[PDB]
Amino acid sequence: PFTADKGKCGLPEIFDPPEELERKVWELARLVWQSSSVVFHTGAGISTASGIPDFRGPHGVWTMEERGLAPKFDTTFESARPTQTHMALVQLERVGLLRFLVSQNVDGLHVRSGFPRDKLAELHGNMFVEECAKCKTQYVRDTVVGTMGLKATGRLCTVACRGELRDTILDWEDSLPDRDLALADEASRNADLSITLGTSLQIRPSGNLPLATKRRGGRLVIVNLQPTKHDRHADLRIHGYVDEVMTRLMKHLGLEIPAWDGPRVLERALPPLPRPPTPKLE
Ligand SMILES: Nc1ncnc2c1ncn2[C@@H]1O[C@H](COP(=O)(O)OP(=O)(O)OC[C@H]2O[C@H](O)[C@H](O)[C@@H]2O)[C@@H](O)[C@H]1O
Numbered sequence: 001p002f003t004a005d006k007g008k009c010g011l012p013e014i015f016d017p018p019e020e021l022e023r024k025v026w027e028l029a030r031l032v033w034q035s036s037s038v039v040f041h042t043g044a045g046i047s048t049a050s051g052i053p054d055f056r057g058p059h060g061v062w063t064m065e066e067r068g069l070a071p072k073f074d075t076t077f078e079s080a081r082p083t084q085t086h087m088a089l090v091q092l093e094r095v096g097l098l099r100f101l102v103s104q105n106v107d108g109l110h111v112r113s114g115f116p117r118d119k120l121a122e123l124h125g126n127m128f129v130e131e132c133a134k135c136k137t138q139y140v141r142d143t144v145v146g147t148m149g150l151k152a153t154g155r156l157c158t159v160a161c162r163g164e165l166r167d168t169i170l171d172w173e174d175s176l177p178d179r180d181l182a183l184a185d186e187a188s189r190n191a192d193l194s195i196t197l198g199t200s201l202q203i204r205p206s207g208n209l210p211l212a213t214k215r216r217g218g219r220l221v222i223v224n225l226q227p228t229k230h231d232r233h234a235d236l237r238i239h240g241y242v243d244e245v246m247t248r249l250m251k252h253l254g255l256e257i258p259a260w261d262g263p264r265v266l267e268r269a270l271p272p273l274p275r276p277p278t279p280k281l282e
Pocket residue numbers: 042043044045046048049054055056057060104105106124197198199200201202203223224225226227240241242243
């Protein structure tokens with residue numbers, strides 16, 4: 001569309017020099033250890049290393065539109081592999097170090113990674129997911145649902161209903177799913193650490209959720225190559241490729257980044273796996 005305000009697009013990148021980057025990721029390690037309720041907020045920057053372009057990066061969808069150019073994909077959504085970051089986030093949840101994951105991404109890669117759906121809010125919906133209008137039954141498909149903008153996909157419900165099935169991809173005018181937003185909001189207020197990963201935090205209300213962690217005295221970490229609307233309210237900013245940051249973080253936490261078996265859907269989180277004992281901080 002046209003009227004849509006697509007915010008600030010194509011701002012310059014920041015590269016924390018190595019000595020400062022290594023120090024900041026150690027400090028992120030310290031905050032993850034110090035924290036009871038860590039919530040992670042992701043955006044399109046965590047899939048760029050999977051061949052999926054972002055929106056407002058140098059070569060983002062909107063940025064290239066603004067220069068009469070096209071975003072470029074190095075994969076299909078179907079052939080896209082979850083990143084090192086995606087798989088870090090799976091392990092951090094499995095070992096009880098991640099309370100909730102709030103994502104703006106429609107790329108479907110959280111779900112395909114094996115990340116438990118009952119700890120994920122997909123604020124902008126999921127390209128692989130269609131929802132029964134009648135009974136609200138969601139199906140996670142192996143291919144992208146054909147439509148966007150909450151339209152009829154041309155498939156019908158099969159619950160023990162014949163309901164109209166619709167894509168879950170929000171148009172600009174469309175408001176967020178209340179279930180996902182209320183749990184996102186809840187996790188975000190309750191958190192004592194919110195970590196943002198490859199989002200620019202320019203979209204209301206998704207981009208404001210990390211700031212609710214600040215009220216009641218929670219810490220905010222923003223990891224991002226470009227500035228973000230809320231760089232100011234952050235106790236830590238890391239200008240780095242998010243895969244280098246997470247692989248170093250995981251290395252500091254003593255956690256392995258698990259193998260991706262290929263697309264799998266886990267509906268409900270299993271009870272936490274063992275995790276290494278905590279270092280003496282103070
Ligand atoms: N490898 C990387 N490492 C770290 N940061 C990265 C990397 N690659 C990109 N980035 C950063 O990642 C950031 C990506 O931010 P944006 O492109 O705004 O994506 P959103 O998820 O916030 O988009 C929100 C909604 O807006 C849309 O209209 C849709 O509705 C979206 O759902 C940039 O700052 C990059 O510098």
